Design a protein around this ligand. Structure first.
Ligand code: MG
Ligand code: MG
Ligand code: MG
Ligand code: MG
Ligand code: MG
Ligand code: MG
Ligand code: MG
Ligand code: MG
Ligand code: MG
Ligand code: MG
Ligand code: MG
Ligand code: MG
Ligand code: MG
Ligand code: MG
Ligand code: MG
Ligand code: MG
Ligand code: MG
Ligand code: MG
Ligand code: MG
Ligand code: MG
Ligand code: MG
Ligand code: MG
Ligand code: MG
Ligand code: MG
Ligand code: MG
Ligand code: MG
Ligand code: MG
Ligand code: MG
Ligand code: MG
Lengths: 63, 136, 386
RNA sequence: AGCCAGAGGAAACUCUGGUGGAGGCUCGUAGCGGUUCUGACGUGCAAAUCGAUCGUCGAAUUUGGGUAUAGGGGCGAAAG
RNA sequence: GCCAUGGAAGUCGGAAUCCGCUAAGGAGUGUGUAACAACUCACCGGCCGAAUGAACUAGCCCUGAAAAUGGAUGGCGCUC
RNA sequence: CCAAAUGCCUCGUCAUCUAAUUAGUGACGCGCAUGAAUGGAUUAACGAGAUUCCCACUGUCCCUAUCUACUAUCUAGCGA
RNA sequence: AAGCGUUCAUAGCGACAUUGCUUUUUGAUUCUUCGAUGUCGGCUCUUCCUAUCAUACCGAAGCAGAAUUCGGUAAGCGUUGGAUUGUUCACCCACUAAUAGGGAACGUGAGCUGGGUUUAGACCGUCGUGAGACAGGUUAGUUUUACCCUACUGAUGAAUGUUACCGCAAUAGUAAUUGAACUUAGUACGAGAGGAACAGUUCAUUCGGAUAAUUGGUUUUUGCGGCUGUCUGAUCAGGCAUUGCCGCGAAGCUACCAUCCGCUGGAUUAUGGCUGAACGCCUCUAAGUCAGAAUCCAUGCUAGAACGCGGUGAUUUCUU
């Protein structure tokens, strides 16, 4: 078992779930589901999306 | 696909039918590869022969050095951009469509590869694996 | 003149007619060859298809480029509470075929199988098998007379079972009754085995085991009247086509001056009896066994039910079979699981499966948590009260 | 086009910024047409229509009414 | 047996095919040998014991004799 | 001026365009049967004219799936 | 069978002659249709033939291996993607195991399309004094109707004493297909150059039957959020914009765009054999008989005869 992390949302990626993306600079991205993959493709900033893990620590919520 | 391959390839989703134009990933001179045929492709009425990652294809060069243009040469697809599933359950894809010019025996005409290379292509073609850098 | 271009036929001619099934319980049309040396066991079982989920396991097959590596595979889980044996039917051999010679029923029948004999249960006086139950009354001599006939005659012996659908989250309230052939033993042992199991349940672990190929026999999912494009996979006509393009352009030559039985035509899609073979059992689970979903590698005390339940079925509170891949039919549907009619030695069989992980994330969306405790740990305490 | 201011140049002369508002110009409504879908309909809404897409849109324009030309005759930017 | 063949000496190729012994034995029918050889055949007998060989002639049957919806001595069927 | 909306032979020959071109373009010209107001050659701009190629773009297609509205469906009335 | 094939008619061919078959050519005929059988081609789809391109099993060779060639049974199963052309035909590019030939009113226009031919408009060239002609070129040019019967695809259904459940199986259909790579093995074979096959495994091609855990697609979940314009005095909350638009979007449906699954027994064809006469020998054949094909029949799978059948439960009064 290797549970991955969402590159956009900090979500647990269990085997089979979501999609892996390889960028032109050969940088791997992993998305738990197509909600996070689409927001990444639209170039949304994960630090400004209120439910992503990157946002939650940036605003110190549930400390 | 075809002859020269170092083993078998588990099925990859086809995303590159004939008439597709994919990038050239090597320093051979070509800047694009126009797929005209897929090696080891079946016959079905009105179905386009379609390539996948690691497939030997027959291609022409549309944009590139004039000495490579107006000829049919073999090529190996190294990036797909069509989502496909590996047997460990992961669906992955690249940004673009990339290939490298090869000969029928499978060895690479250029000496380097620009960008990531699919693992299935590297495993099946040892000469692509030698000239590849990062792999997925 | 000729086609000008060869192509394979569309659709399979051996699966005709593409008509609705006669019953919602697809019948077993063949049982495995009997070798009478083994003990008396069942040749098939009844189940309700709960749904599908995901596993991870290590592949064990040399030669493959995923050997000794974690592969991800789809499984379907079927709810199998034990079947209650309530009858036995003797089948004599005849120059016209098998023929039921007589039937013997258990003295007590539950209401869940009594309902099977009624169209309007709620209005009736519930008189089914009331006079027959008086054939065991004095000393059961008449019952013993019938069982002896099955011993003397009846070269083929089949037992009658009904499901315990009360222990299932179906609204049906009415059990499914079926004939299951008895293999192993001779005719006398088969009759004695049936007699001793009257009114007693039979667990699924006694007939099935892990890593064996079994067949599914179910009616597929119904779709109603369907056109020829999605019923037979025929080419859609060009965009320019007047008076319809989801059709077959030429439905026959001038001669013979008839439409052929082999031309694709619109009609019913789905709700057909189908028998698919070679489904390996990946886990024979147990009902009163918390950590059904745990494996040797997980140790998470979780059952097989996905988080929030099986969508459109409910929870699995009984035993279950868990076979690799997909079986015909949809959720909530009575399915018959049958042992293989031949010995498979493919090396895709004969290989022991050890599960490394079972998915229990919700199938009602993009479930991102396997258990409520996992969701609680990742997400923390919420506003919703405790 | 006409007109005003300015600049360069030894002379010829050249240039710039404004003004003005021309044209069987052009984009495009109403209007007048009727290209394509060879779409709809094709015992129709209709013995020629409907929908989209189109041509033109200040004049060789469109149009009402009055009036003239009548059958080997009329009328025709011409298709019998 | 003569040439010729590294090598053919009945058996690549040419070429001849005489009579002594004879119940029979041809410088040859073949297998053949690197080549003879050896074996086999033509021929002869101390061995059997009923017909055999060649050419043809025509009766029936068979081969020659391949089409497209399933099918037609009328059908079933029929073999001293 | 030309294998042209005119050339039968003809898919003329050569070049270019393509992986491949009876298409397109550029050349050649004894041209069945081009050619000078029965107007010749050219020509900016214009064209719902005919034709070829390229970029963009896409369900035209690979390869089809899904959704909506109105039908079709069943019912009452009406009814060719 | 004169010759070719180093010698050698018949491995493979084969002159001079001669015997046929076929009706996918074109002629020839004018029997049917002129109170009309819609006309070329292509698309779509089914089935049939075998004169077999491939695949199975074989026989032969001027078959060492490899690759080929000839021939047998065999139509079970496949026989493609493109440039040009309306094209049938043709030609080339390329993949492939192979890109075989045909038929079905030159299959198939109330299935399509309408590029061509083949109405009326127009231009050219040649011919004609002219009107005009051209199986010469060019361009534009309405493709109608099924609701009837049958057929086919699905779907009900009277009658069986009633009703219910569990079953049998006559008949009919039937399905899987082909390649690569590793190993065998650089092995046999060959002087070398080259270079196999059987068994084993891993995959793939084409077809089929399902299924929806995942991934993708779809969105009237008008579920949530956002945005424009306008209206409800503002706020909140909404209406309208023929589904206003954008992003996400469960459920459901669905994709070689996803995954799973696709059985084994017998009898045979060609052929090779055994025993064994005819014919004191020989001989696969005459009597017997062995093995043996992608064949056939079953196992299996689908339907279940609505005029085939079996077992089993209950069978109506305080009810003219
Ligand atoms: Mg054909
Ligand atoms: Mg399933
Ligand atoms: Mg779900
Ligand atoms: Mg104007
Ligand atoms: Mg204008
Ligand atoms: Mg204008
Ligand atoms: Mg207007
Ligand atoms: Mg049309
Ligand atoms: Mg129309
Ligand atoms: Mg008159
Ligand atoms: Mg006159
Ligand atoms: Mg007869
Ligand atoms: Mg000329
Ligand atoms: Mg040309
Ligand atoms: Mg072109
Ligand atoms: Mg020219
Ligand atoms: Mg034949
Ligand atoms: Mg025809
Ligand atoms: Mg017709
Ligand atoms: Mg028509
Ligand atoms: Mg036309
Ligand atoms: Mg049958
Ligand atoms: Mg909302
Ligand atoms: Mg608003
Ligand atoms: Mg309003
Ligand atoms: Mg409005
Ligand atoms: Mg013998
Ligand atoms: Mg059946
Ligand atoms: Mg019946």
């Amino acid at each position: 078992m290797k549970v991955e992390i969402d590159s956009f949302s900090g979500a647990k990626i269990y085997p089979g779930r979501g999609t892996l993306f390889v960028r032109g600079d050969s940088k791997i991205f992993r998305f738990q589901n197509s909600k996070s993959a689409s927001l990444f493709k639209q170039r949304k900033n994960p630090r400004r999306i209120a439910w992503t893990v990157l946002f939650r620590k940036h605003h110190k919520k549930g400390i | 696909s075809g002859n020269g391959a170092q083993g078998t390839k588990f099925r990859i989703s086809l995303g590159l039918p004939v008439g597709a134009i994919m990038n050239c990933a090597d320093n051979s001179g070509a800047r694009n590869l126009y797929i005209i045929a897929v090696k080891g492709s079946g016959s079905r009425l009105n179905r386009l022969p379609a390539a996948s990652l690691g497939d030997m294809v027959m291609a022409t060069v549309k944009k590139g050095k004039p000495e490579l243009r107006k000829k049919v040469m073999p090529a190996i697809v190294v990036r797909q951009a069509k989502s496909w599933r590996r047997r460990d359950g992961v669906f992955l894809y690249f940004e673009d469509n990339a290939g490298v010019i090869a000969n029928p025996k499978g060895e690479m005409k250029g000496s380097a590869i620009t960008g990531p290379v699919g693992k299935e292509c590297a495993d099946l073609w040892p000469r692509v694996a030698s000239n590849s850098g990062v792999v997925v | 003149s000729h086609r000008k271009y060869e192509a394979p036929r569309h659709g399979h001619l051996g699966f005709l007619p593409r008509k609705r099934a006669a019953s919602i319980r697809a019948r077993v049309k063949a049982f495995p060859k009997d070798d009478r040396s083994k003990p008396v066991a069942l040749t098939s079982f009844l189940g309700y298809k709960a749904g599908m989920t995901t596993i991870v396991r290590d592949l064990d097959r040399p030669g493959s480029k995923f050997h000794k590596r974690e592969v991800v595979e789809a499984v379907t889980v079927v709810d199998t509470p034990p079947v209650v044996v309530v009858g036995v039917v003797g089948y004599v051999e005849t120059p016209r075929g098998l023929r039921s010679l007589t039937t013997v029923w258990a003295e007590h029948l539950s209401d869940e199988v009594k309902r099977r004999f009624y169209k309007n249960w709620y209005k009736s006086k519930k008189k089914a098998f009331t006079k027959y139950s008086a054939k065991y009354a004095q000393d059961g001599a008449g019952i013993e007379r019938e069982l002896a006939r099955i011993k003397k005659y009846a070269s083929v012996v089949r037992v009658l079972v009904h499901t315990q659908i009360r222990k299932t989250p179906l609204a049906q309230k009415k059990a499914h009754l079926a004939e299951i052939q008895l293999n192993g033993g001779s005719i006398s042992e088969k009759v004695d085995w049936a007699r001793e199991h009257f009114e007693k349940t039979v667990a699924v672990d006694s007939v099935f085991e892990q890593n064996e190929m079994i067949d599914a026999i179910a009616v597929t999912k119904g779709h109603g009247f369907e056109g020829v494009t999605h019923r037979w996979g025929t080419k859609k006509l060009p965009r320019k086509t007047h008076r319809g393009l989801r059709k077959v352009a030429c439905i026959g030559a001038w001669h013979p001056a008839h439409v052929m039985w082999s031309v694709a035509r619109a009609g019913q899609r789905g709700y057909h009896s189908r028998t698919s073979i070679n489904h390996k059992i990946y886990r024979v689970g147990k009902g009163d066994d918390e950590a059904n979903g745990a494996t040797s590698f997980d140790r998470t005390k979780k059952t097989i039910t996905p988080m929030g339940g099986f969508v459109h079925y409910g929870e699995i509170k009984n035993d279950f079979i868990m076979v690799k891949g997909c079986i015909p039919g949809n959720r909530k549907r009575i399915v018959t699981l049958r042992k293989s009619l031949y010995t498979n030695t493919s090396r895709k069989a004969l290989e022991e499966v050890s599960l490394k992980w079972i998915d229990t994330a919700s199938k009602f969306g993009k479930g991102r948590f396997q258990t409520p405790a996992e969701k609680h740990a990742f997400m923390g305490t919420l506003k919703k009260d405790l």
